[PDB]
Coordinates of C-alpha atoms and ligand atoms in Angstrom, one line a residue:
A1 CA 116.3 78.3 102.4
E2 CA 113.8 80.8 100.9
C3 CA 114.3 84.4 101.8
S4 CA 111.0 86.1 101.0
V5 CA 107.3 86.3 102.1
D6 CA 104.1 87.5 100.4
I7 CA 101.7 89.4 102.6
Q8 CA 98.2 90.9 102.0
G9 CA 96.4 93.6 103.9
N10 CA 92.7 93.9 103.1
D11 CA 89.6 96.2 103.6
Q12 CA 89.0 94.6 107.1
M13 CA 92.3 95.9 108.5
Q14 CA 93.8 92.4 108.4
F15 CA 97.2 91.1 107.4
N16 CA 97.1 87.4 106.3
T17 CA 99.9 86.5 108.6
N18 CA 100.8 87.4 112.2
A19 CA 104.2 85.8 112.4
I20 CA 107.2 85.9 110.0
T21 CA 110.3 83.8 110.3
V22 CA 113.5 84.8 108.5
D23 CA 115.9 81.9 108.0
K24 CA 119.4 82.5 109.6
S25 CA 121.2 81.7 106.4
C26 CA 119.4 84.5 104.4
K27 CA 121.6 87.6 103.7
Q28 CA 118.7 89.6 102.3
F29 CA 115.0 89.2 102.9
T30 CA 112.1 90.3 100.7
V31 CA 108.6 91.3 101.6
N32 CA 105.9 91.4 98.9
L33 CA 103.0 93.4 100.0
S34 CA 99.6 93.6 98.2
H35 CA 96.2 95.1 98.8
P36 CA 93.4 92.8 97.5
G37 CA 90.7 95.1 99.0
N38 CA 88.7 97.8 97.2
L39 CA 89.3 100.8 99.4
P40 CA 91.8 103.5 98.3
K41 CA 95.1 104.5 100.0
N42 CA 93.7 107.5 101.8
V43 CA 91.2 105.6 103.9
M44 CA 92.6 102.0 104.0
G45 CA 96.2 102.3 103.1
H46 CA 98.5 99.6 104.3
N47 CA 102.3 99.5 104.8
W48 CA 104.5 96.9 106.3
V49 CA 106.9 98.5 108.8
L50 CA 109.5 96.6 110.9
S51 CA 111.0 97.7 114.2
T52 CA 112.1 96.2 117.6
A53 CA 109.1 95.4 119.9
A54 CA 109.9 98.3 122.2
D55 CA 110.1 100.8 119.4
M56 CA 106.8 99.9 117.7
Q57 CA 104.5 102.2 119.8
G58 CA 106.8 105.2 119.2
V59 CA 107.0 104.5 115.5
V60 CA 103.2 104.1 115.2
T61 CA 102.6 107.3 117.2
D62 CA 104.9 109.6 115.4
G63 CA 104.0 107.9 112.1
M64 CA 100.2 108.6 112.4
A65 CA 101.0 112.2 113.2
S66 CA 103.3 112.5 110.1
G67 CA 100.4 112.3 107.6
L68 CA 99.6 110.6 104.3
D69 CA 102.2 112.3 102.1
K70 CA 105.0 110.9 104.4
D71 CA 103.4 107.4 104.3
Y72 CA 102.5 107.9 108.0
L73 CA 106.2 107.6 109.1
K74 CA 108.2 110.3 110.8
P75 CA 110.9 111.5 108.5
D76 CA 114.4 110.0 109.2
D77 CA 113.0 107.8 111.9
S78 CA 116.0 105.7 112.8
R79 CA 113.7 103.2 114.7
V80 CA 112.3 101.9 111.4
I81 CA 114.5 98.9 110.4
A82 CA 112.8 98.3 107.0
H83 CA 109.5 99.2 105.5
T84 CA 107.4 99.0 102.3
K85 CA 105.6 102.0 100.9
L86 CA 102.0 102.7 101.9
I87 CA 99.6 101.2 99.3
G88 CA 95.8 101.2 98.6
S89 CA 93.4 98.8 96.8
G90 CA 95.0 97.0 93.8
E91 CA 98.6 98.2 94.5
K92 CA 101.6 96.1 95.4
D93 CA 105.0 96.9 96.8
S94 CA 108.1 94.9 97.4
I95 CA 111.1 95.7 99.6
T96 CA 114.4 93.9 100.2
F97 CA 116.5 94.5 103.2
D98 CA 119.8 93.3 104.8
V99 CA 119.5 90.5 107.4
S100 CA 122.5 92.1 109.1
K101 CA 119.8 94.4 110.5
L102 CA 118.2 91.4 112.3
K103 CA 120.1 90.0 115.3
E104 CA 119.6 86.4 116.6
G105 CA 117.0 86.2 119.4
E106 CA 116.0 89.9 119.3
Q107 CA 112.3 90.6 119.2
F108 CA 110.9 92.4 116.2
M109 CA 107.4 93.6 115.3
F110 CA 105.9 94.3 111.9
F111 CA 102.8 96.5 111.6
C112 CA 100.9 99.0 109.5
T113 CA 101.2 102.7 110.5
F114 CA 98.1 103.9 108.8
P115 CA 95.9 105.6 111.5
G116 CA 94.3 103.0 113.8
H117 CA 95.5 100.0 111.8
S118 CA 98.4 98.7 114.0
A119 CA 96.2 97.2 116.8
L120 CA 94.8 94.7 114.3
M121 CA 97.6 94.8 111.7
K122 CA 100.7 93.5 113.5
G123 CA 102.8 90.4 114.0
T124 CA 106.2 89.1 115.1
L125 CA 109.3 88.7 113.0
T126 CA 112.1 86.5 114.2
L127 CA 115.4 85.2 112.9
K128 CA 115.6 81.4 113.4
Ligands
CU201 CU1 118.8 79.9 101.2
CU202 CU1 96.8 99.5 107.1

């Protein structure tokens, strides 16, 4: 089974997927994030941040408060399971994380933590 996904965030605050499936036999999983828009990082930055569903609101809230130089994530936030860096127009970032962080049946959310973006830029991740 494949163990990666390619995702885009654009100038309209849209991800091109709202649901990610990680195959149970994967030991690592890779997320390839790209920004095909034209707007720069400081006004339309996008990251891909993963947490349990219950933790998302907290991660997003503290994140936005943390500011651009911290990629809109609270330092040493143990609620973040895995995340890309924050990127603007024309950039791309890839992260690979351990599936051992992803328990069978548990509910996970991915989202962008750039201010205001998470309402429209979010989706589910599950291990099947
Ligand atoms: Cu495989
Ligand atoms: Cu964003």
